[PDB]
Design a protein around this ligand. Sequence first.
Ligand code: ZP5
Length: 121
Amino acid sequence: SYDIQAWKKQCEELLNLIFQCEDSEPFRQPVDLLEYPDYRDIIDTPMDFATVRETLEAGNYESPMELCKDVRLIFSNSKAYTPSKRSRIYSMSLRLSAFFEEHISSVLSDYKSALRFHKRN
Ligand SMILES: O=C(Nc1ccon1)N1CCN(C(=O)c2ccco2)CC1
């Protein structure tokens, strides 16, 4: 497909699948500072899947690369806030990251291919 717009619905569907994963539940809404009072000492830019979905639905992503950067920030924040690489919530992040990367690969490839076809002449 050379459809330059198709990534948006493909990302909406992938976010729906991520919301059906039990592994996403800790990453759905902005982190709880009352539970994790040091969190914002450690993490410069909070990110969560509800923020990503709202940004997409507002029309405030230009490309699936930008959405991918925010989703990867959810996972780097978990890797950097975790007190242990054997932690429950951290291990949930690693499985969910593998699922996300498996699905986003085609979305990025198709978008970049569509843009190259648009600029072919
Ligand atoms: O508090 C939340 N999430 C909430 C709170 C209300 O809704 N979602 N956390 C998820 C993100 N997070 C981690 O990545 C992590 C790694 C090791 C321990 O925690 C900190 C805890």
